[PDB]
PDB file of C-alpha atoms and ligand atoms in Angstrom:
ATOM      1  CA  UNK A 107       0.000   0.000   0.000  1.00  0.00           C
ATOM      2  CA  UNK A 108       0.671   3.763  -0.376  1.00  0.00           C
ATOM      3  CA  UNK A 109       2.964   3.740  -3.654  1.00  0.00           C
ATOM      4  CA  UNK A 110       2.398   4.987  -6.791  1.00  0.00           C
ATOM      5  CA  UNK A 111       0.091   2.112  -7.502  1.00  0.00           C
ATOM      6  CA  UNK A 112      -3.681   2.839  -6.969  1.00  0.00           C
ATOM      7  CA  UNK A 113      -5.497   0.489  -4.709  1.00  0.00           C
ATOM      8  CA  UNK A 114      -9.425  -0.260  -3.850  1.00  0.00           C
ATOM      9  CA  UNK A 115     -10.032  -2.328  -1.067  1.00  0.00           C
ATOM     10  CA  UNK A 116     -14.082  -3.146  -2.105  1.00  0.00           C
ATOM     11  CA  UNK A 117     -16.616  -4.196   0.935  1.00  0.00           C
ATOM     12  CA  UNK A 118     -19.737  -6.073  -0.162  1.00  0.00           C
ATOM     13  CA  UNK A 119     -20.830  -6.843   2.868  1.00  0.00           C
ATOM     14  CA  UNK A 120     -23.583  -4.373   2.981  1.00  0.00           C
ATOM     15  CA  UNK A 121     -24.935  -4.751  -0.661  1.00  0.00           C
ATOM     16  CA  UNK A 122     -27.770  -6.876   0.398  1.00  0.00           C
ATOM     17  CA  UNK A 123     -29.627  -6.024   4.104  1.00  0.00           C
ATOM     18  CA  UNK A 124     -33.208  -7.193   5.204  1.00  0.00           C
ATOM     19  CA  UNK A 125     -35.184  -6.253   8.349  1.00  0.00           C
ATOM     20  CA  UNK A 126     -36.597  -9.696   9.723  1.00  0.00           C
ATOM     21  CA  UNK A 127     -39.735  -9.557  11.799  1.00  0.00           C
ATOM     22  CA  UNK A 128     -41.874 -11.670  13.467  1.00  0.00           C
ATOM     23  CA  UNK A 129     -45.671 -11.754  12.815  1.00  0.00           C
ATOM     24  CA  UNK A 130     -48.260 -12.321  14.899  1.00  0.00           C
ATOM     25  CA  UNK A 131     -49.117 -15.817  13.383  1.00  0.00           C
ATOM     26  CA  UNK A 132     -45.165 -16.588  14.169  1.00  0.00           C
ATOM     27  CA  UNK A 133     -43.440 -16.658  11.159  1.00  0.00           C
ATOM     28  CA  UNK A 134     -40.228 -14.551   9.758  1.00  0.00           C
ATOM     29  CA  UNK A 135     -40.845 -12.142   7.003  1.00  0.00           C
ATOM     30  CA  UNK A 136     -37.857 -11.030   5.406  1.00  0.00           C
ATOM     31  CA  UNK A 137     -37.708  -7.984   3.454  1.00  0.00           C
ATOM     32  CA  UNK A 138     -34.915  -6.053   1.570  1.00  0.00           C
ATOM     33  CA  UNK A 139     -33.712  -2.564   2.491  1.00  0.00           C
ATOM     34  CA  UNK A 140     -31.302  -0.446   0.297  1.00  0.00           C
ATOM     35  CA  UNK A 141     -28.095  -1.438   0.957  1.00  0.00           C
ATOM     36  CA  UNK A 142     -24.309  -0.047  -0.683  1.00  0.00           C
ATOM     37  CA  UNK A 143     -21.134  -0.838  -1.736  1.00  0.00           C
ATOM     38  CA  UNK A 144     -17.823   0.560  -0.453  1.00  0.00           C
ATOM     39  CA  UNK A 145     -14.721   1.170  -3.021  1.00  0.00           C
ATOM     40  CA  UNK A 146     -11.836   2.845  -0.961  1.00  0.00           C
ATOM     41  CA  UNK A 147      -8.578   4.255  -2.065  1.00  0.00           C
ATOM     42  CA  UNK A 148      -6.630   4.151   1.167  1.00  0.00           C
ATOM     43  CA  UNK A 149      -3.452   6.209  -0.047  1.00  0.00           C
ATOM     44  CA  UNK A 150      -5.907   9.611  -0.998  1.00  0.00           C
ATOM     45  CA  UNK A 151      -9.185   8.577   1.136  1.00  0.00           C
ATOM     46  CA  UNK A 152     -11.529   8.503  -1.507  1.00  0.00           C
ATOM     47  CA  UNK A 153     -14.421   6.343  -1.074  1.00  0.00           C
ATOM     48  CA  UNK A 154     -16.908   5.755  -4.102  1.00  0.00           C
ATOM     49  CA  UNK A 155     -19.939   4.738  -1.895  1.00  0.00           C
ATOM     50  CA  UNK A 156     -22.565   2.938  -4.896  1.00  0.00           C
ATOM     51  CA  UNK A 157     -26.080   2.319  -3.240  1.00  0.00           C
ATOM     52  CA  UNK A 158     -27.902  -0.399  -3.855  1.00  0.00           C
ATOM     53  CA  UNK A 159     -31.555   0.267  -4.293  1.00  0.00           C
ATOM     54  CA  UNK A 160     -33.782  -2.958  -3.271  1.00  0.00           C
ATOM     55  CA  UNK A 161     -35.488  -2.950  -7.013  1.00  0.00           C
ATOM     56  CA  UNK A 162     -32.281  -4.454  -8.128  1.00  0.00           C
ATOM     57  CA  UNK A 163     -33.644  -7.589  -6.119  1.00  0.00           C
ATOM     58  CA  UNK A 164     -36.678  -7.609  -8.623  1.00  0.00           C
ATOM     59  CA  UNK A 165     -37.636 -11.000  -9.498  1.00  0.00           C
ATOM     60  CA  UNK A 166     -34.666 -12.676  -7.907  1.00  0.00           C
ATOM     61  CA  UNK A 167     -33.360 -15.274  -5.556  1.00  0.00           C
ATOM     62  CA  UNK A 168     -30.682 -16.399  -3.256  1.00  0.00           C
ATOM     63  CA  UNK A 169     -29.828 -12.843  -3.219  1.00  0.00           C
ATOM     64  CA  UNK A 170     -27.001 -13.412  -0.462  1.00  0.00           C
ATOM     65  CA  UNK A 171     -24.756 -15.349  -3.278  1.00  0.00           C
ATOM     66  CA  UNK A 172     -26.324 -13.012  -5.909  1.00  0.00           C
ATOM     67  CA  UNK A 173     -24.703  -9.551  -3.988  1.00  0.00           C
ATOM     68  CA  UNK A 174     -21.533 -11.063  -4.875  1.00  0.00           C
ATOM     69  CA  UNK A 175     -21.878 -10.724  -8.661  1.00  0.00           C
ATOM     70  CA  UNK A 176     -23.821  -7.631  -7.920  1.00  0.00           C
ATOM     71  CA  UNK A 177     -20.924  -6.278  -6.482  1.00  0.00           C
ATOM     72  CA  UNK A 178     -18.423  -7.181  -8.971  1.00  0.00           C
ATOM     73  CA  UNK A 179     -20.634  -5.614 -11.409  1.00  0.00           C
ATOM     74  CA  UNK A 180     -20.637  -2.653 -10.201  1.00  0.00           C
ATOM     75  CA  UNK A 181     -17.156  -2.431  -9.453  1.00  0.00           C
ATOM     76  CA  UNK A 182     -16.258  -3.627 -13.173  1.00  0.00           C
ATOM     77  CA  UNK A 183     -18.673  -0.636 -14.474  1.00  0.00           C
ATOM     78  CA  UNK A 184     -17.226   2.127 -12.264  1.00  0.00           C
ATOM     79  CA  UNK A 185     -13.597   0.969 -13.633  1.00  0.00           C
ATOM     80  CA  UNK A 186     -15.095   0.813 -17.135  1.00  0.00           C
ATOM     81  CA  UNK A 187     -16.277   4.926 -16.489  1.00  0.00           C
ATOM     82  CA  UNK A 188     -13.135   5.944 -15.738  1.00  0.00           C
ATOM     83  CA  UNK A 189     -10.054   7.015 -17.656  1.00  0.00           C
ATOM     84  CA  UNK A 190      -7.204   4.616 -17.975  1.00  0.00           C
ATOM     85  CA  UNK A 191      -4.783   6.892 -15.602  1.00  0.00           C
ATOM     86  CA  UNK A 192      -7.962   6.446 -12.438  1.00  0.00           C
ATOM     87  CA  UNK A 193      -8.449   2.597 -12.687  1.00  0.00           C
ATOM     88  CA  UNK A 194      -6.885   0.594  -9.994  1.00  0.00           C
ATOM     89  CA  UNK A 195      -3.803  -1.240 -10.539  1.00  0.00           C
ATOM     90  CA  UNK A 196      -5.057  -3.314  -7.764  1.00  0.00           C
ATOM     91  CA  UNK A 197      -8.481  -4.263  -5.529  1.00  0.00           C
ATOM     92  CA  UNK A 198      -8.267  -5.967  -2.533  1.00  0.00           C
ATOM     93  CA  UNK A 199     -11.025  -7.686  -0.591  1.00  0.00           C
ATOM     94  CA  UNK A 200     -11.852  -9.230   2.887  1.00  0.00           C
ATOM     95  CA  UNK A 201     -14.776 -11.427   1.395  1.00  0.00           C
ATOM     96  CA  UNK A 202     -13.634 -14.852  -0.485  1.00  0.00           C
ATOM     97  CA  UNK A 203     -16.209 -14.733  -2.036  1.00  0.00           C
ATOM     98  CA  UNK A 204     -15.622 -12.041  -4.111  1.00  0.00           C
ATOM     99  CA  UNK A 205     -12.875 -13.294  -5.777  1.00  0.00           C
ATOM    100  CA  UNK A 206     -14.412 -15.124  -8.467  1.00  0.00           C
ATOM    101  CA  UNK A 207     -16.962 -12.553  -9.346  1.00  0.00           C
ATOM    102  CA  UNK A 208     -14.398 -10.202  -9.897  1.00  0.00           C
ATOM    103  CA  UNK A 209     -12.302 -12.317 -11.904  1.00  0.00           C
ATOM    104  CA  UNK A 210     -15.067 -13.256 -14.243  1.00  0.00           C
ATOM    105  CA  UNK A 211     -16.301  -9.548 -14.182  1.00  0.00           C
ATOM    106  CA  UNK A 212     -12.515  -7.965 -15.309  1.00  0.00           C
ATOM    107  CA  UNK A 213     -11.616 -10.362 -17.644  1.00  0.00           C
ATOM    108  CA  UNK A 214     -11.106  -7.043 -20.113  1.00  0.00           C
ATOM    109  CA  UNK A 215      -8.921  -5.653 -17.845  1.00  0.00           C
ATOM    110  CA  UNK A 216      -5.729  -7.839 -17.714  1.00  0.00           C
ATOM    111  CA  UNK A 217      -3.546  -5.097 -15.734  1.00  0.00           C
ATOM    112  CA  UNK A 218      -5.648  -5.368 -12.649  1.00  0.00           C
ATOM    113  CA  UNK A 219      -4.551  -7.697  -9.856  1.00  0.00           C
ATOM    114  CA  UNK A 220      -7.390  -8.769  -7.319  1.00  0.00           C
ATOM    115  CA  UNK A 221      -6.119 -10.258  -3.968  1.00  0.00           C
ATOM    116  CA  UNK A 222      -8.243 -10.922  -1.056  1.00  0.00           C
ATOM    117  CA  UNK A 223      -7.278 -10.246   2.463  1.00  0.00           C
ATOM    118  CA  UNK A 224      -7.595 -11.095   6.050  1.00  0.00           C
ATOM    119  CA  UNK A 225      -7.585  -7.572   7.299  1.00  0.00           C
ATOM    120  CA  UNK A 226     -10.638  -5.901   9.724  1.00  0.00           C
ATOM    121  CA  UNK A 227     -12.139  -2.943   7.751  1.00  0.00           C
ATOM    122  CA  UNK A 228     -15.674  -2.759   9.065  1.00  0.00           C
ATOM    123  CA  UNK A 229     -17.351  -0.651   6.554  1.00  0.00           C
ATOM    124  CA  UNK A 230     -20.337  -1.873   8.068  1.00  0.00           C
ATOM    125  CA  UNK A 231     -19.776   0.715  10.931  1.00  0.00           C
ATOM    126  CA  UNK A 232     -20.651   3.825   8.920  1.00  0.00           C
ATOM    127  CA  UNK A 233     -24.049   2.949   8.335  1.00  0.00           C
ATOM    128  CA  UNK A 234     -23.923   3.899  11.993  1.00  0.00           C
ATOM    129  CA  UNK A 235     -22.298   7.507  10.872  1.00  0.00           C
ATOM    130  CA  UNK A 236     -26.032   9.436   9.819  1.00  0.00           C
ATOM    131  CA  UNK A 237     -24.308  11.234   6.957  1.00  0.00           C
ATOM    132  CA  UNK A 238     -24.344   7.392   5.055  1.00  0.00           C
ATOM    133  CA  UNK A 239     -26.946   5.705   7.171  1.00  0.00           C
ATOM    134  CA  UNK A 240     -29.717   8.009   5.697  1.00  0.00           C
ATOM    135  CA  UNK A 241     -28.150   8.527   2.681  1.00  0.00           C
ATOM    136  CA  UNK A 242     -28.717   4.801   2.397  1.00  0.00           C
ATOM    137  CA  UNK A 243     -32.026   4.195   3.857  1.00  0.00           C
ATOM    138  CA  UNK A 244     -33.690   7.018   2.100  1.00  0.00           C
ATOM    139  CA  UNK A 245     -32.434   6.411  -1.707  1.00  0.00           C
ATOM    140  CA  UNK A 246     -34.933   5.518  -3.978  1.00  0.00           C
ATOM    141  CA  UNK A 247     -32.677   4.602  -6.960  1.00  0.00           C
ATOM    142  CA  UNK A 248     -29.308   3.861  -7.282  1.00  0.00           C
ATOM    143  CA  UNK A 249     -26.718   6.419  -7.239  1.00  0.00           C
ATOM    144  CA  UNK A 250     -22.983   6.929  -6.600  1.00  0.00           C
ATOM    145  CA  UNK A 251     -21.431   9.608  -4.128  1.00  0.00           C
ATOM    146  CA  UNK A 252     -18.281  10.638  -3.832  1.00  0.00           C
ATOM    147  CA  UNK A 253     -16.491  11.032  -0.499  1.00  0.00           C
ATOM    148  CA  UNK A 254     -13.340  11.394   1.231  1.00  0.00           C
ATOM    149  CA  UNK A 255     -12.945   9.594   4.661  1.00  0.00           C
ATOM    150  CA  UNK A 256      -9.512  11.623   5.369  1.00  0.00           C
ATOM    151  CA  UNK A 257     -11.110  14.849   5.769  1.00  0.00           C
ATOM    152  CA  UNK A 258      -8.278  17.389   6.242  1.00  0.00           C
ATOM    153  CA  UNK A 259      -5.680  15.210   7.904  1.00  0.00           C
ATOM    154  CA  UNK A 260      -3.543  15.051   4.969  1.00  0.00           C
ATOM    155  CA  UNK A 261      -2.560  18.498   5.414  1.00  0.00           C
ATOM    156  CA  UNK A 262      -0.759  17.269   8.535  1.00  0.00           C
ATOM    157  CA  UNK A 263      -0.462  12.976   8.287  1.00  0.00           C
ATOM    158  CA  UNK A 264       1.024  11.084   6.233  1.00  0.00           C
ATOM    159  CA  UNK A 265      -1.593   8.088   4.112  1.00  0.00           C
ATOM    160  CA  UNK A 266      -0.543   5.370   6.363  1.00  0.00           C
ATOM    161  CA  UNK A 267      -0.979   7.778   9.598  1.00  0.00           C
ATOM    162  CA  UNK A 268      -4.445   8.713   7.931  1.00  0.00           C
ATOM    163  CA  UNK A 269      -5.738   4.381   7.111  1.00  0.00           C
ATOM    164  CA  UNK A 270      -4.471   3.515  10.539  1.00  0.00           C
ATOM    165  CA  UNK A 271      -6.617   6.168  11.722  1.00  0.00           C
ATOM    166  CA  UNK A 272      -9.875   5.573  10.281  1.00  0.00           C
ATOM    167  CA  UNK A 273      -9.074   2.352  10.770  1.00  0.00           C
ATOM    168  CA  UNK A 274      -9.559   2.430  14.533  1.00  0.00           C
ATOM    169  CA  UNK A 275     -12.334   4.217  13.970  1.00  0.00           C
ATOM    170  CA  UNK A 276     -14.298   2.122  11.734  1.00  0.00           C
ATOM    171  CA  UNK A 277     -13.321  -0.709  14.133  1.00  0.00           C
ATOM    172  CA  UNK A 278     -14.224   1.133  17.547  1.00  0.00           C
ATOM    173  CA  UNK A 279     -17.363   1.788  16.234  1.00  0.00           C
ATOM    174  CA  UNK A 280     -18.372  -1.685  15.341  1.00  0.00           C
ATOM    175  CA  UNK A 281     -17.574  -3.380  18.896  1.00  0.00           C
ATOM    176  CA  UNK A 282     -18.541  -0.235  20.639  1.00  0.00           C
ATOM    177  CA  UNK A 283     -20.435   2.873  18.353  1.00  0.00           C
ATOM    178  CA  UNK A 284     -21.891   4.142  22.003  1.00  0.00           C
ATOM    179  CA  UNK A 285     -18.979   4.231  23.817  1.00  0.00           C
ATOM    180  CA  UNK A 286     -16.619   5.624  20.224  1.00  0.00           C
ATOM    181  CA  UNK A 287     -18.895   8.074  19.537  1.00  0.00           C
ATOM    182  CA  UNK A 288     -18.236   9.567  23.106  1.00  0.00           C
ATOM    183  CA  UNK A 289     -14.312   8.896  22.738  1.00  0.00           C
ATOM    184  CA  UNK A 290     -14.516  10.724  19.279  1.00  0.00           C
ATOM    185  CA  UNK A 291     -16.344  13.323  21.187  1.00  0.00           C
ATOM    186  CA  UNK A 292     -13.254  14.863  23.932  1.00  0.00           C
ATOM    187  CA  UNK A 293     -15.462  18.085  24.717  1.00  0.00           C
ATOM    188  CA  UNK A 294     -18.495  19.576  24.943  1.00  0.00           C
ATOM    189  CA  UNK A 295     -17.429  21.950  22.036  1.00  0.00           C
ATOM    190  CA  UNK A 296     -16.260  19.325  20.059  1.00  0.00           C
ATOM    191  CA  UNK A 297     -17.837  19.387  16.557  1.00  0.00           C
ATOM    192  CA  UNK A 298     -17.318  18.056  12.680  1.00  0.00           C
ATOM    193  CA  UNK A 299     -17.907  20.115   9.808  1.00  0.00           C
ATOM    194  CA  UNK A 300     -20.523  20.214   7.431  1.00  0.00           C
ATOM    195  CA  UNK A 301     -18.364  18.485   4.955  1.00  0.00           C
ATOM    196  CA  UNK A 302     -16.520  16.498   6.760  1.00  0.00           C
ATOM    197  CA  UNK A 303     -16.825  12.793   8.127  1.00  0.00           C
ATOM    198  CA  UNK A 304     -15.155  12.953  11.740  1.00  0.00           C
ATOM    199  CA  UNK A 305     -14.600  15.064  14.307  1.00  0.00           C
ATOM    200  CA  UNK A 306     -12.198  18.641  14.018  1.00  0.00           C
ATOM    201  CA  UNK A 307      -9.566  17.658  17.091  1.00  0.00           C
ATOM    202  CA  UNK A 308      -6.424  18.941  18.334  1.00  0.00           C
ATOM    203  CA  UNK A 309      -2.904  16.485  17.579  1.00  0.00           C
ATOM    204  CA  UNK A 310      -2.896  15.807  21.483  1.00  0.00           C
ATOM    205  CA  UNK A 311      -6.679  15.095  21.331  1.00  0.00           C
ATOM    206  CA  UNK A 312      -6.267  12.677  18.224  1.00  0.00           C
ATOM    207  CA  UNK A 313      -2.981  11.133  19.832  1.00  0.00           C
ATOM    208  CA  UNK A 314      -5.723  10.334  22.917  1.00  0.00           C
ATOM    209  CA  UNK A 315      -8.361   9.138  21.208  1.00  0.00           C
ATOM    210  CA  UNK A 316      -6.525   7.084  18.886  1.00  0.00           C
ATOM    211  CA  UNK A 317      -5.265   5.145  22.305  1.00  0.00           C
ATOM    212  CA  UNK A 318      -8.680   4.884  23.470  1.00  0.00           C
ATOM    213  CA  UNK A 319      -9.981   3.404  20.562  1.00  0.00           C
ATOM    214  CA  UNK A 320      -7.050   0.742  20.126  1.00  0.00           C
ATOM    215  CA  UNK A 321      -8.257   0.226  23.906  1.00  0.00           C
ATOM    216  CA  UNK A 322     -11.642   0.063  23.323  1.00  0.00           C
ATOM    217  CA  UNK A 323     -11.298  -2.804  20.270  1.00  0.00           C
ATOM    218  CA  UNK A 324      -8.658  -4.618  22.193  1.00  0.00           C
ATOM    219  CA  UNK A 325     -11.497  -4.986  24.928  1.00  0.00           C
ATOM    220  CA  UNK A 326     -14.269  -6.189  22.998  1.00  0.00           C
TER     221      UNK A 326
HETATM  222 CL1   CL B  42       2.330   6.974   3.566  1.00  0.00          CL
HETATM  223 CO1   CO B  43     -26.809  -4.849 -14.880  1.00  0.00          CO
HETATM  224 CO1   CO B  44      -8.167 -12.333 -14.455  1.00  0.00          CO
HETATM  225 CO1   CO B  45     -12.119  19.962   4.722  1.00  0.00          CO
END
């Protein structure tokens, strides 16, 4: 990571979501709810976020096994809307299951390697943020946004400062999002910008938190 090669790390893990309830004659209904992708570039911090409206769904089954391709779809048609000089020269994922799909998926696109991994990115965690939890539940067609999960800290940090960072975060919130959001919160004042994703804090206050988050996922 970090050279002059770009890198995607893609999460699927959140493509396809349901809300399971119980009815009163005692059965399990299972319904989809929008769900998204997560394409992240971990040396700038750009994150193409690709929702995943439940009318993709239409008329089909075992849709668990089906987000897979779904994902590698997408993936393959963001790369294909891109100029030569943006495409990854590598994508990395966590699911195993991806793998295949994406090999099948970029067969026209011979310079890109695709490796999976074991690490712990927990995506997953900012559907807890409410700047993508809405933006997800509230879609009524798919859609890409554009974001950057660095915010101003590569003014200051270095790109593997900045992924270690967010990191932690993403994992904090996951075991913990009650007691992170209160770490990520030092003081009363504390606040995050409009268009930013985390918190504006000091280099002492992001030294502390930092520690308290390793803490907190350490404890789990
Ligand atoms: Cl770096
Ligand atoms: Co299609
Ligand atoms: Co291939
Ligand atoms: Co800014």
């Amino acid at each position: 990571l970090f050279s002059n090669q770009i890198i995607w790390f893609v999460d699927d893990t959140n493509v396809y979501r349901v809300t399971i309830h119980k009815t009163f004659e005692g059965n399990l209904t299972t319904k989809p709810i929008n769900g998204a992708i997560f394409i992240f570039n971990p040396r700038t911090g750009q994150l193409f976020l690709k929702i995943i409206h439940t009318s993709v769904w239409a008329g089909q089954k075992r849709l668990g096994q089906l987000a897979k391709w779904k994902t590698a779809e997408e993936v393959a048609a963001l790369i294909r809307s891109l100029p030569v000089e943006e495409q990854p020269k590598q994508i990395i994922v966590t699911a195993k299951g991806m793998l295949d799909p994406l090999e099948v998926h970029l067969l026209d696109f011979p310079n890109i390697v695709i490796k999976g991994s074991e690490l712990q990115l927990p995506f997953q965690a900012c559907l807890k943020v409410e700047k993508f939890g809405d933006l997800i539940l509230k879609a009524t067609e798919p859609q890409m946004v554009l974001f950057n999960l660095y915010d101003d800290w590569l003014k200051t940090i270095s790109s593997y400062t900045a992924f270690s960072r967010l990191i932690l975060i993403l994992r904090a919130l996951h075991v913990n999002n009650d007691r992170a959001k209160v770490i990520l919160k030092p003081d009363k004042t504390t606040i995050t910008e409009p268009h930013h994703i985390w918190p504006t804090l000091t280099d002492e206050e992001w030294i502390k938190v930092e520690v308290q988050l390793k803490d907190l996922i350490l404890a789990d």
